[PDB]
Amino acid sequence: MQVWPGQAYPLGATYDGAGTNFAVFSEAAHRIELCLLHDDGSETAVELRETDAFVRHAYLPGVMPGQRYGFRVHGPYAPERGLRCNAAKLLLDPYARAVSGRVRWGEAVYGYPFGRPDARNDLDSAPDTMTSVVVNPYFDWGDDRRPRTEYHHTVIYEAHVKGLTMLHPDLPEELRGTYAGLAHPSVIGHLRELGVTALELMPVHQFVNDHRLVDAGLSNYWGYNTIGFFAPHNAYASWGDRGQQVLEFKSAVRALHQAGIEVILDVVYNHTAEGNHLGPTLSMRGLDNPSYYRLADDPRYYMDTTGTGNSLLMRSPHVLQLIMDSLRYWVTEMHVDGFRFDLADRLSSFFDLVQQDPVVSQVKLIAEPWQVGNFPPLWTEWNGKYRDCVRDLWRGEPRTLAEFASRLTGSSDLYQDDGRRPLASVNFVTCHDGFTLRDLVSYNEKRNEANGEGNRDGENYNRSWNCGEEGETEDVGITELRARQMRNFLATLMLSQGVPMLSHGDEFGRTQGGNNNAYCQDNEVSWVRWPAEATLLRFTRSMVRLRREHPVFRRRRFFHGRPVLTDIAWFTPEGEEMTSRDWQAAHAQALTVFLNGNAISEPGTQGERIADDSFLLMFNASAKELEFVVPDSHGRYWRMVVDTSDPEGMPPQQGPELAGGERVTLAPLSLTVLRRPA
Amino acid sequence: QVWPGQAYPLGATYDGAGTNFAVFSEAAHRIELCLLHDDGSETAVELRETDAFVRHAYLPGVMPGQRYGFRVHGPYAPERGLRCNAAKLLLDPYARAVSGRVRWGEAVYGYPFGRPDARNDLDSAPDTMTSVVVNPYFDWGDDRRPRTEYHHTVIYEAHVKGLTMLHPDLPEELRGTYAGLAHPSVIGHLRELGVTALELMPVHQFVNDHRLVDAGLSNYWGYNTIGFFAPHNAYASWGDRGQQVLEFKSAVRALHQAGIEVILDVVYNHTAEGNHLGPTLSMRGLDNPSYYRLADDPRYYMDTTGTGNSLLMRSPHVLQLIMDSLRYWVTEMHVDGFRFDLAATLARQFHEVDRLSSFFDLVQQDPVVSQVKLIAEPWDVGEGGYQVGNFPPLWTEWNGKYRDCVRDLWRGEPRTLAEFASRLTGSSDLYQDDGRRPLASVNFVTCHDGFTLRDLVSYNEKRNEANGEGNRDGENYNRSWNCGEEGETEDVGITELRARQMRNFLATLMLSQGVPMLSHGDEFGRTQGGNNNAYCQDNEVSWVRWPKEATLLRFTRSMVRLRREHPVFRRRRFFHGRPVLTDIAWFTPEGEEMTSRDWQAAHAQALTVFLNGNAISEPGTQGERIADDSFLLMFNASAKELEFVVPDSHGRYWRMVVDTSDPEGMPPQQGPELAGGERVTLAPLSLTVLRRP
């Protein structure tokens, strides 16, 4: 069987039309065998003899897309030195473009014998692991254009690929819960009409169903257990797992771009599915353990800075190269538009590589900072302080107004000194972590007993109010207050400076029963129920529309304040400008903000001045009715455009005209917006 | 008309309707884009939109050929390392084309000549170089990067101007220019010599040092870079307003058509702005603490052994500039590889491993940069940073130990045969343990640093007084022997020996494992009159004199041909040696196996090396066996006639193919055939090579 020396680059299996180049890195390896799997369970093994800077490689003529392959590394098994090579284990190609199968849990997938953690286990793992597959790279994108929606026009919608469409009645059964279902015109239509410009997907890199969850009757639903950083998770594909999942994902991106929607991927580079020293041996632990993972003071064991078993070695050059090769691959070959990272001196070279890379540095780079306000000036960040503060406003925490004013206006205290814009602030009321929007107005405390960890998992301080009853209620008064509270949250988010993120299904009032950490619930707890929910839907679409049609809510600069033209002003509910004393009043829970649509200094794309209507934002988060006074001349008139006290949705319902100096009564825990054209 | 534009890419990008301008500075309070007109006047525009400290604007209607520059308003505080000074017209570090030349006066300095810590408010615009907007268009046609594997590579280091300044076939307009490099007479000379890669000495735009100009000298070699994205304008016949780009591309396109790669000597470790008394041209005025490694008293600059300043290699925008530069020269200028010098002098507490870790990380992972030829000059042997053998295994290196050892052997230095055997076979002791191939050692006997080949056999000591530093510059320990007289001679005996010695060096280079590098003009026996550091000699000291069928050229062309025809001299694996076929064997001149006693004897100055051509284990590109003839290399590094016995069975015949003591050149002359067991005497300081099928 013909074997040529081939190329050390690129890494992985590269098909050229007549054959396939294989190249895999290990500096611990003594010998590396490429194993070609056949459909009958047999193997043909061929040595990767040619080595260049510890990359072994060979080109194999006649090897074609669809071929299943793996690697066997012959090398030391010395855990006291951090070496865990075990040639009985068929290893996943870290660069695999497609991964087939699933893990069948048993002794074979572990590298140690089932009595002793530091001895060696000799059963062949090949029939019980996932396997890499050679991919044909061809895909006709036609006129595919990346939307390149600027941040001040962005609305992010975080969605789970399976849960978003698992119960959608317009889709055929085999598209439901799949990548292809994302391409369905009904799903794309709903995202379009919501005003969504960026679909952020929960992890789509090939991950593993944790043995712990499988053994407990659960499954890894969210996917924060990556094993394949180049392969789209095969369980979300209905077209098949031998390359077809690549085709599926690409056609989903292509359909979303035809609708003008960006694809952002949640990517999890901080750990892998191989876990701690008692986890399985599937790819990197068997390839080169000290080069990939951060090892403890005792090299037998793994630094676990996240709770997820292990930690990638961020100073290691082939870890950095893999991460970058992966980001470039998802942008350049999968046509995604950005990334959401959790990197829970060590990150310095990583940040250096991101910043200078001409492909990656130009996509949307969104960070989970957990480090709030400390990512480099090209990163935007999830603003958890925004979430906690807005949650505090509407639950009545009694000194929130001063901080809420900052969060409402882009959190300058967090980003201005770094040299960023308010658009660095990704604001959100809910996400996949914690309560859904409806559970947040319905539960004081989390209900995660179905996750099998004794209610020890998930956030303990939810900053939530059940509105008078824990859980589901018959009371129409509670039900209506809950519905307004949800409107308060959604409206606060769409009227805030920064970049707003919505959590899939919140536009429908999705509930998880008070489960605030549903990572392991691949069932009706989490799946979107497609459709009272018509008032919430109408209210959300119109709130997104208001934001889209008024630039003063989405400025590129921080508000200037009063110069010693005024672009923003703060008033008491009785209509007097607010003093420094006013900000500390203990039961200060109400406020009027004036936003001056005549005072937007940022030019538009061709240098033109940007003009807008002006607004009055009246917040009552006391538990009582309050009279507000429109601060203005008695002859100037203001149109009420938002009133979250309206049970039918204002918007889209439109409101009365108000004269300056005229009193208006706001219901407890309510928001009203007025719109004088100026 | 001014639009916000974009912060990426950095520099002036022309789209067809106008030009985007983006420049980095963390220290600036305001940045003014200045647009110079041919009458000296300026139209200033603020770069108001700022993003991660990149200020940018798009100017519709601004066209290629537009001269521009930056003025940074910001703090002048040398105590804090801030040297922003809006009176200085600063260069765009990303300038694709730099026009003009520095006119040395007080206006180009950030400080007044009496007080280094005061601010100099003179306008610098009439005395500095200016950046030029360029049209990126170029029709490359069928252009292909040769991607010549290392085991087929013959490098030829050349100075753009000196290579062709005196070439009689070129019209005067082209002599010494990028256009000159593309002349069919120049390309044809390289093709016939066997050259596969042309390594050009610094072509990045550089500055004529004030200390040289105020001495009647100039900067000829160019290790004083100011523009890392622009081809040096003084090497361009076509003009300096954008044409220098087109001319450089023409040269690369012409060389690729002959199948010759371009390697660029690149100097990223320091700039032409020098220490705190140097001028303020680009980066010192833009963001001084971001660009330069500053001393603990930030007024002052850490340096890199006496160049003046040192780029901050841990700075993200320094790394981005270097990577952008590398990518630009590869992707758009189409060059094939780089020779780096990353030397610096760090204070005790800091280490080179942490200074360059990100840089090496960046280079290894980048899809474009990591796939071109990456050649490093190591720190020199004493002042240890990255010493030879230490660069990461993706890199190849100038092997200075090869140079020293082969010079010592043909000098007759006492105990050289041991190290020589190692250098001759790829320097296994420098490259085998780190996982590299013998192709990691760029071998050479001469380069632009030190003596030319002819001077290496003509002088015991350097003569650098014309360079203006009292003979203190350049290497003191050349490992040279003048063959019996210092300087030129009319003695026929010393001339014969000098010619033989030059064939010894070239034959030794071409038979050694590794990648050979030739120094331009050594094929014509170029001389510098014993000047061993001719960096400031832009004159007949340095330029190549072209002949008007010389023995040396004929001998060199055929030695390169000998290597190209026989894979045993350019293997991809280190020699296995004895255990088990035997691929290499070492013999005394009397013809018996070298023991460990023979390598260390004082008298050990002569060797017979056997190279087994049926023992090449590494496959070719389609997995087939590589086969070659077998060879005997007989070295007489002693100073007497010496008898060698052919170490072979009693009835096998060998062809003599190299004999450096033949004065008409062998090769290409064809010698006789000898039988195993025969005695043949070799002249002192001579080399004979025998070939058997």
Ligand SMILES: Nc1nc2c(ncn2[C@@H]2O[C@@H]3COP(=O)(O)O[C@H]4[C@@H](O)[C@H](n5cnc6c(=O)[nH]c(N)nc65)O[C@@H]4COP(=O)(O)O[C@H]3[C@H]2O)c(=O)[nH]1
């Ligand atoms: N960067 C790079 N360098 C190479 C390669 N092949 C050889 N080198 C070098 O050539 C020397 C001799 O290789 P050899 O004749 O095959 O002699 C080798 C070979 O017979 C065998 N060996 C080493 N590695 C392997 C391997 O991976 N597979 C097999 N089948 N044999 C190996 O043991 C001998 C001594 O091995 P070394 O100490 O490593 O010394 C090696 C090694 O330094 C390569 O593919 N890439």
Ligand SMILES: Nc1nc2c(ncn2[C@@H]2O[C@@H]3COP(=O)(O)O[C@H]4[C@@H](O)[C@H](n5cnc6c(=O)[nH]c(N)nc65)O[C@@H]4COP(=O)(O)O[C@H]3[C@H]2O)c(=O)[nH]1
């Ligand atoms: N002509 C000129 N004036 C400058 C500049 N930088 C600051 N200023 C002026 O001084 C005001 C205070 O600036 P700030 O502290 O940076 O507070 C700024 C700053 O944090 C932010 N920001 C404003 N423009 C930009 C920008 O272009 N890029 C980024 N990343 N942030 C900006 O908006 C806030 C309010 O800015 P303004 O309303 O415009 O009001 C600014 C502006 O009038 C400049 O480079 N050129």
Ligand SMILES: C[C@H]1O[C@H](O[C@H]2[C@H](O)[C@@H](O)[C@@H](O[C@H]3[C@H](O)[C@@H](O)[C@@H](O)O[C@@H]3CO)O[C@@H]2CO)[C@H](O)[C@@H](O)[C@@H]1N[C@H]1C=C(CO)[C@@H](O)[C@H](O)[C@H]1O
């Ligand atoms: C292994 C680990 O699984 C479970 O942890 C899951 C979390 O409950 C989820 O909240 C989810 O966290 C991710 C966030 O949703 C996301 O926003 C992102 O930032 O990454 C987060 C973490 O990666 O994903 C986790 C599952 O992927 C479980 O609750 C947790 O207790 C489990 N840790 C056990 C594992 C062993 C070692 O294998 C021990 O090290 C630990 O002490 C165990 O508790």
Ligand SMILES: C[C@H]1O[C@H](O[C@H]2[C@H](O)[C@@H](O)[C@@H](O[C@H]3[C@H](O)[C@@H](O)[C@@H](O)O[C@@H]3CO)O[C@@H]2CO)[C@H](O)[C@@H](O)[C@@H]1N[C@H]1C=C(CO)[C@@H](O)[C@H](O)[C@H]1O
């Ligand atoms: C400024 C510096 O100019 C002279 O230094 C030159 C060297 O003599 C040349 O040999 C050449 O060195 C380069 C190598 O050829 C090359 O292989 C590469 O590795 O880089 C080397 C250094 O870049 O190029 C140099 C000039 O371009 C001169 O001999 C030297 O004395 C001069 N240094 C003076 C400058 C002042 C500050 O401005 C002080 O710091 C020093 O003490 C001065 O001596």
